[PDB]
RNA sequence: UACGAAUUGAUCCGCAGAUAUCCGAAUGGGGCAACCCGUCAGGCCCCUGACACAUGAAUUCAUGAGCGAACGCGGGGAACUGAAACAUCUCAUUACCCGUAGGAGAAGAAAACAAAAGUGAUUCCCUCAGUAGUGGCGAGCGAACGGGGAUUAGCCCAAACCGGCUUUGUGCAAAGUCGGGGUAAUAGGACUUAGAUAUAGGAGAACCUACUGGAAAGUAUGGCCGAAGAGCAUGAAAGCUGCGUAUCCGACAUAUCGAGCACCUGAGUAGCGCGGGACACGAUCCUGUGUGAAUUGGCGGGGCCCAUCCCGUAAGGCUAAAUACUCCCGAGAGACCGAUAGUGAACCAG
RNA sequence: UGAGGGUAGGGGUGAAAGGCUAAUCAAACUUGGAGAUAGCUCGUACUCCCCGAAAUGCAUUUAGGUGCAGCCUGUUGGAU
RNA sequence: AUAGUAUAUCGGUAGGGGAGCAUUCCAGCGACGUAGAAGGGAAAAGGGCGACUUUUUCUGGAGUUUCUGGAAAAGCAAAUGUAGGUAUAAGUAACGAUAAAGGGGGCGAGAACCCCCCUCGCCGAAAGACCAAGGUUUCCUGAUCAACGCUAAUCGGAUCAGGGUUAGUCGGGGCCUAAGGAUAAGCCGAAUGGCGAUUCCGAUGGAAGAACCGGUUAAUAUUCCGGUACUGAUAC
RNA sequence: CAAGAAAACCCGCUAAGUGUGUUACCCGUACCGUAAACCGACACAGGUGGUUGGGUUGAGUAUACUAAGGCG
């Protein structure tokens, strides 16, 4: 599943619009990558599939709170 | 429930054999017809199996048959009363059979 | 045709039980559906009985899977066609494909409308109105406010602060977890039923003579019943022949019905740039990508924007009714068809 | 040459002929959108009575179409 | 049409206007019918005109209808129009390889064709014999000749009924794997899902378990019987 | 020279731990099958994989004539 595990972000459907206003279907994809993280509280490593927006949340409230927030809303499963 | 049954004595009230009484021989419930003894004879043509024409009673539709009164000899309508239920003749009121 | 059952109550009807091979989600493993091959525990004797043995998500146990009308909500999403050509636009947020509920679903309790005059949740109907708008300002598309109705209903958290317990750092402090406190817009808060119904049943009035006729229920007399003159059947057209109808009566089962104080009031959120989408619409709402506040003297809206004034309290949640539909069950009807009609199918019918 | 597999529709496959893909191929078949659209051709059913044309002008991606005028007819009011 | 009988007018395509008939059903007031309704055949008569109507008689054997108003699935001659039936071409084409028939008996209502016999002719690396695929009772026997058989038929691969297929070794299957398929752990992806082992499935191939000759039935035969062999388990 | 499947059966290795008798389950087995029975709407001059296929003549499984058997 191509879903961010911290934010839940997935691809959205839109249009290409030309100068003559021809509209053709397109996909807006997520800036999604796999990254390894050191988890200070648990003294371990985890690998997450997150967006660049999810990394911003990790680098603001910390890893541990981000995973707790992600598990409440149902993003990590 | 039917207003007649086997062994009953009934009088024909319509048809060519009207005014004639007789005993009930067999009741065909699904077709609502009955055989009355001695009435509505037919001439059946049978092959040997010695052959010949033979006589038999043909069934009469049961709505043309009424149970004869116990006391008087005329046909009457019937009813059922608890005095299980039992049939009785509407003309005289006595129990039937 | 043949043999039997039954007034010691057969057949038949209602209710509850017993049995219920093989395939099929098919689930012990395989497989070309209705077949083949096992492990394990028992009992009979090369075989044969009778158990268990899939997977996935929770804690051995519990759960799910599959099928099936329409109505709901989500994810994707055409073209012919119209524009008397055609690309914006239209057809249409249709057809169609996929996922997934319930007896309905969705919505729903104002960060709302309005315009110094007021109404206060949502839904649905009649108007407003083919109006204001929108639009290669073409073809087209198309509101809301206000008024009249149906139905009516309102609530719960988080936080301040207090207590306990666990954990962590070092008695203190932080986090987590339960208990108490508390729930705003005129701002508020903290502290200082058991009967009825349903699925079998019981009773239920009253007609004679003559003619025609194969056969009267017809016709002509003379009677009678009516809370019953609806109907169907009976050798022709029956209130009084039969089954019924009006009315009344019934269930062993099972099913259903104070002052002060400035402590708190939801954050990668509101807002913004770039690219798209939905709104009637080629300020408002949603977001792929990059960023990013304040705290009641706050914040949001009133169709660029600023000032003033008015209205309201986002980033937590729950809620009946008035609305949508018919695979189906019961009761009915039709200035609807009557066998090349009416369903493809009155029979034997996918 | 036999058996069993595999490639599926703007796709396949082709010692290349636009060949072949179930007697169908310059884009298979089936069902649906769907009664697509057709300024084109053909067809349009009982009776009697009164009146009764046009095949011109202008414009048109128009010329075998259409809009307006001209010419017919109903009702109504005026005389011309 | 104008005036209220007089004057004028009455050929018509596209087209405009007026007035009527029939059909199905409904409301109302009413009628007809087994002493014969509807429908079908024949005949006669009517209508300013017509669409149509009425009567009589035969058939038929149970429904039908006037008037006033109301509502429509409300009228066919043609669409290379549809269904069903029946014609014409016409007693015509044709009866499906030019391998071929003749005679005597038989059963029988019936024989060019069926059965038996004698002669003739054709195939014979096949037009003979044994399997596989596919078919699924067509196999044998009795009864039958309606339909089927391109003629007739006493005959048949036809109709009905009865009967008939026998395995320790044959062919399969049980075992093994190929192409390919389904998967496990994993990977990818709006959904539906797409991939992915040394795992499993999957013969057209490999198996270390082994049979051949003869004879008997109307119809089976390494299967039944005879003779002579072989291969696993199991108990002493 | 173009360089000619796989796995199992059957034999090793360690790790971990002859005689007699009885008996041999399942499915197929008819018939057609270079055809009147299969694929072609037909009792259709077409198509349909493998094995066998006597004698004389011949190089021959060609050709001609014949047996068994099958046919007109
Ligand atoms: K199974
Ligand atoms: K709490
Ligand atoms: K195509
Ligand atoms: K009628
Ligand atoms: K015979
Ligand atoms: Mg167009
Ligand atoms: Mg459900
Ligand atoms: Mg509701
Ligand atoms: Mg303003
Ligand atoms: Mg029909
Ligand atoms: Mg060319
Ligand atoms: Mg072809
Ligand atoms: Mg095309
Ligand atoms: Mg359409
Ligand atoms: Mg069409
Ligand atoms: Mg004239
Ligand atoms: Mg033209
Ligand atoms: Mg004109
Ligand atoms: Mg004249
Ligand atoms: Mg005229
Ligand atoms: Mg022709
Ligand atoms: Mg001729
Ligand atoms: Mg000739
Ligand atoms: Mg011919
Ligand atoms: Mg000839
Ligand atoms: Mg011939
Ligand atoms: Mg042969
Ligand atoms: Mg035979
Ligand atoms: Mg014949
Ligand atoms: Mg036979
Ligand atoms: Mg074998
Ligand atoms: Mg295997
Ligand atoms: Mg044989
Ligand atoms: Mg033998
Ligand atoms: Mg193996
Ligand atoms: Mg055989
Ligand atoms: Mg022949
Ligand atoms: Mg060949
Ligand atoms: Mg050979
Ligand atoms: Mg030879
Ligand atoms: Mg030869
Ligand atoms: Na009763
Ligand atoms: Na008559
Ligand atoms: Na007609």
Report yes or no: B78 and B88 within 8 Å, Cβ to Cβ.
yes
How close is the Cα of B12 to the center of ligand 38, in Å? 87
How close is the Cα of B53 to the center of ligand 17, in Å? 89
Backbone φ, ψ for residue B78 (5° rounding): -125, 165
Distance B52 CA to E113 C1' (A): 47
How close is the Cα of A46 to the center of ligand 19, in Å? 113
CA angle centred on B8, ends B7 and B14, rounded to 5°: 130
What does the alpha-carbon distance between residue A14 and residue A69 come to, in Å, rounded to a whole number?
Answer: 29
Backbone φ, ψ for residue A61 (5° rounding): -105, 0
Sort B64 into a burial class: Cβ within 10 Å, 0-12 / 13-18 / 19+.
middle
């Amino acid at each position: 599943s191509k879903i961010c595990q911290i934010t839940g972000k997935k691809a959205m459907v839109g249009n290409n619009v030309s100068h003559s206003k021809r509209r053709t279907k397109r996909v807006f994809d997520v800036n999604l990558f796999r990254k390894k993280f050191y988890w200070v509280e648990q003294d371990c490593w985890v690998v997450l599939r997150i967006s660049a927006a999810g990394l911003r949340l990790i680098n603001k409230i910390g890893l541990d709170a981000a995973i707790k927030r992600a598990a409440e809303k149902g993003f990590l499963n | 429930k039917l207003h007649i049954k086997k062994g009953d004595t009934v009088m024909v009230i319509s048809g060519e054999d009207k005014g004639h009484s007789g005993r009930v021989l067999e009741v065909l419930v699904k077709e609502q017809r009955a055989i009355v003894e001695g009435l509505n004879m037919i001439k059946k043509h049978a092959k040997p199996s010695q052959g010949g024409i033979i006589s038999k009673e043909a069934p009469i539709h049961i709505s043309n048959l009424n149970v004869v009164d116990p006391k008087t000899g005329k046909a009457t309508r019937i009813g059922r009363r608890l005095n299980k239920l039992v049939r009785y003749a509407k003309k005289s009121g006595e129990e039937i059979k």
